[PDB]
Amino acid sequence: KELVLALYDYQEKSPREVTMKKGDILTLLNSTNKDWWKVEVNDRQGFVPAAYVKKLD
């Protein structure tokens, strides 16, 4: 799939969100929304702000 790099820590603030640490390599599940992307962080899935991750090309 697609991988993204976490640019900052992000602590989930809502049920559909997930937490990540700066430096994390996340599997990107859905990037159809411009503000919130669905990612896999270890054994969890949910939304983090699109601005806080960077697609790995």
Stated in angstroms to one decimal place, the resolution of this structure is 1.9
Domain containing 31 equals 1-57
Domain count, the chain: 1
How far is C-alpha 50 from the geometric centre of its chain's CA atoms?
7
Locate tokens 């949910």: which residue?
46
Residues 6+ apart with CB under 8 A from 38: 28, 29, 30, 31, 45, 46, 47
Q: Report the structure determination method.
A: X-ray
Residue 13: strand, helix, or coil:
coil
Rounded Cα distance, 30 and 53, in Å: 13
Run of H or E residues at 4 = strand 2-6
**Which CATH number goes with the domain that contains 15?**
2.30.30.40
Rounded Cα distance, 26 and 40, in Å: 6
